[PDB]
Write a protein that binds this DNA or RNA. Structure first.
Lengths: 80, 96, 103, 93, 96, 80, 103, 93
DNA sequence: TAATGCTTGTGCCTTTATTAAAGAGGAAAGTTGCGGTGGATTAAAGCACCATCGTGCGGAGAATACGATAAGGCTCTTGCTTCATTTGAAGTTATTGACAGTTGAATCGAGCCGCTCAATTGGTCAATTATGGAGTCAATAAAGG
DNA sequence: CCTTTATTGACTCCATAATTGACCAATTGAGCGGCTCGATTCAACTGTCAATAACTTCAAATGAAGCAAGAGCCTTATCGTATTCTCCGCACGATGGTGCTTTAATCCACCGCAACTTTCCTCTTTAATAAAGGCACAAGCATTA
């Protein structure tokens, strides 16, 4: 798979900023947000895949994601 | 015809999206991006639906918090427009 | 056979909490019964606090059920609970707040 | 296999506090996760306290100290009061 | 006589104090402040000397980091002077 | 004891800011820094006194301070 | 009597690390010898990395002893070690850095 | 009583890396504290991994996973390589 | 002020989907009894912690002259918002096929536990070497010209 | 560019204190044996994940017009800075008094283990009611006048 980071469309980033209270948005903010989201997903997915590989599995479960989020101080409630 | 002055519709969406609890990013593009990122760590990986849902919830929560901090930084610089420098400052202070 | 929870006047299970504490002890550790009673008491107190705030939030919205939105409202509306519960609530959203300079 | 949770006890507490207000399944799961997190934090703090003082037994004193360390301010004070009351009632019965 | 332009001596102390590793706050006033603060939690507390030394080291490290973040915030607002609003912004982004 | 927060003199705060790379310092920064330091010391000392009271002691040791700092994500090296 | 450290080709004590891991185990946990060997290997590797960087920093300053200042310089000069070691080093100071706009 | 530390082994490692460079007492104490912190982190991660997978025994696989989780990037890669080499040498003896 | 488009709050029927209520049975908590470890108690020594005293000098407090930084205002121009049109891809539904997760049994590899030996590690002491202090010189930068 | 002056690195020598090397004990790691248990392997099978196809219609892409927000510049005034003088209290050295911390021995008290019972909690099933949808309505707001 390639260039899937562009699937996070500009309207989606605008909606996320609107939920965050942002009134005006610059043009480069979309690319900056895509890069930041890519970094965050890289970290979380790396930890989740490590957890999955330890369990000798090929399928990433919600438990692995929850543990990966908890490791980085980003605890999530609503998935176990 | 009829036009709203700039900043009014934006305030309307600020009010609308803060009251809701739905997900803002489309599910299928986010799933494809997650699979693309994960294929770098291990080939032939499979994902549970709940795993991708949790990833999306966490990612959007993180992005909303980062945008709140970015708006704080932008207001600090006597501006209403958020800029990449604001995001960079917020992430630097956060330790990222 | 009277349960320890009723002896301590609690709703949370003292026996299950004691078993969990025993399984979570390290290197031949021992857990007293009073420790389990104390743990159950704080767990039930925190549950009661969060549920009371969430029920008040639900009543303010004229609904008869608690949802993750109400839990988010209750937790972010209380300074102590906001400090204690730093985790993300799925489907909770954010507290409606717009800065003065943007209006 | 059976997965043990706190849903029944959360429901009893809710019926004590709000008799006419129910709770959704997602909210109940979130409450269960929150209680699990609090119990994990208390257990970790109690184990650390036991290790520091070379005391292998975890008693109500360790739980009280862990509550004072973990819970903030007035919340910690009220939690300590509730725990003390529960322990006194348990010992007197 | 001879006067240095403002900002020169300041830069000299920036260079001097960054190269050193000594403690910047006087020991006795910090000890008195620590005892005064601790007396609010428990009456008749005694302090081991190493405890006060560790408290001073941690406090000065925290203050130096906070001042670095404050300087970042001040530079963001196109200023060289740090202001209480900069400290407040830095602490808000840090979550304090 | 009273007015001991004033024992953190303005030259000391200026030196701390100089070590932090600050070139110009406002006049209210000193009071703001005193308040922030008081809050930080309150938190650390509260945790340290809790640790000391658990050990049934009257003297606060360096171990209590180290544990209190570690609890808040402010780990300190050089005192054990 | 051959030591396990010499068998594993290590300088850190494999037996002491195994004993510490056993005392840190929870609720009838078990620790293998290979686990202790692995732990000792990573501890020795991290020690070697930090000490090599600190020795290089000391040599750059024309001194023959490692001080907390040299440890601070070595740790903050390496991205991986800076990420790993977030603790405060007593007597380490700060890395000399002045922003461009303040000059 | 005797307080056990890592000073002897840190000195051996220093002599292997820098034969002519010494270390101060403060720096040695800081290194010992850093080693203790790393060991505590690895032990905590290994215990969490053992609890998650319901496997009471902690083996080299748990330590490898904990190293991958805790140590960052190339540092984790080199640490894993060193640990695997040490385990292979130990088993071959 | 004021009309007027306009978006959002608000009321009513659907229905549906999401929660409340019950049954078996199995999993686990309570009970009783006992052994043995651990926590509370008490006494003693030592050291460390606090309070006192003298002093004396380096750092802090305060005032002065002032330069340069921050804030305010004005302009302009360009970058971002809002609206309208087309489209193309996400969402829904129905289907399927196989991969992989999970459970259950045997069993063999391996870690715990005891006890003894002895070799490594830790505390203490004498010193020698690297580091800092003090002082003068030279190289560097800064400020007015 | 220059010259004069304040600052700091460097060079030297000497004090010194801080690390290094040696010696006794004590402590725990290694060795060897026995035993139980848990991690690995195999396999069945079912849960669900990925891939497919068709339809739809809603949100995304793009462009046009225009407005207002950000950046640059100029001014000013006030407020932090550098310097000098006085003083004051921190730091060092010496001392003593005691309290409180740590250790050791004793003892009792309470917690883990084991087996049995009984009863409470947890999937599965069925009914029910609260809320999101859909549709229409009212009104506070924004916009130009």
């Amino acid at each position: 798979l390639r260039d899937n980071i562009q699937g996070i469309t500009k309207p989606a980033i605008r909606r996320l900023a609107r939920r965050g209270g942002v009134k005006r948005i610059s043009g480069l903010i979309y690319e900056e947000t895509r890069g930041v989201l890519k970094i965050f997903l890289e970290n979380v997915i790396r930890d989740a895949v490590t957890y999955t590989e330890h369990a000798r599995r090929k399928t990433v479960t919600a438990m692995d994601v929850v543990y990966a989020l908890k490791r980085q101080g980003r605890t999530l409630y609503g998935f176990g | 015809p009829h036009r709203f002055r700039p900043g009014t519709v934006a305030l309307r969406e600020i009010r609308k999206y803060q009251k809701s609890t739905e997900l803002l990013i489309r599910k299928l593009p986010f799933q494809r991006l997650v699979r693309e990122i994960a294929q770098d760590f291990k080939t032939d990986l499979r994902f549970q639906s709940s795993a991708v849902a949790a990833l999306q919830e966490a990612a959007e929560a993180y992005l909303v918090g980062l945008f709140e901090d970015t708006n704080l930084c932008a207001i600090h610089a006597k501006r209403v427009t958020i800029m990449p420098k604001d995001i960079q400052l917020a992430r630097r202070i956060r330790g990222e | 056979p009277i349960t320890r929870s009723s002896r301590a006047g609690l709703q949370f299970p003292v026996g299950r909490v004691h078993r969990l504490l025993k399984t979570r002890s390290t290197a031949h550790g021992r857990v007293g019964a009073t420790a389990a009673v104390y743990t159950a008491a704080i767990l039930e107190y925190l549950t009661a606090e969060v549920l009371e705030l969430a029920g008040n939030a639900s009543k303010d919205l004229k609904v008869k059920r608690i949802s993750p939105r109400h839990l988010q409202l209750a937790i972010r509306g209380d300074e102590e609970l906001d400090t204690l519960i730093k985790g993300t609530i799925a489907g909770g959203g954010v507290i409606p707040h717009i800065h003065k300079s943007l209006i | 296999k059976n997965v043990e949770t706190y849903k029944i006890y959360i429901f009893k507490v809710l019926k004590q506090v709000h008799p006419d207000i129910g709770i959704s399944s997602k909210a109940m799961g979130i409450m269960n996760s929150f209680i699990n997190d609090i119990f994990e934090k208390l257990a970790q703090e109690s184990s650390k306290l036991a290790r520091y003082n070379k005391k292998p037994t975890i008693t109500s004193r360790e739980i009280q100290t862990a509550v004072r360390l973990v819970l903030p301010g007035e919340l910690a004070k009220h939690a300590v009061s509730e725990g003390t009351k529960a322990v006194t009632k348990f010992t007197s019965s």
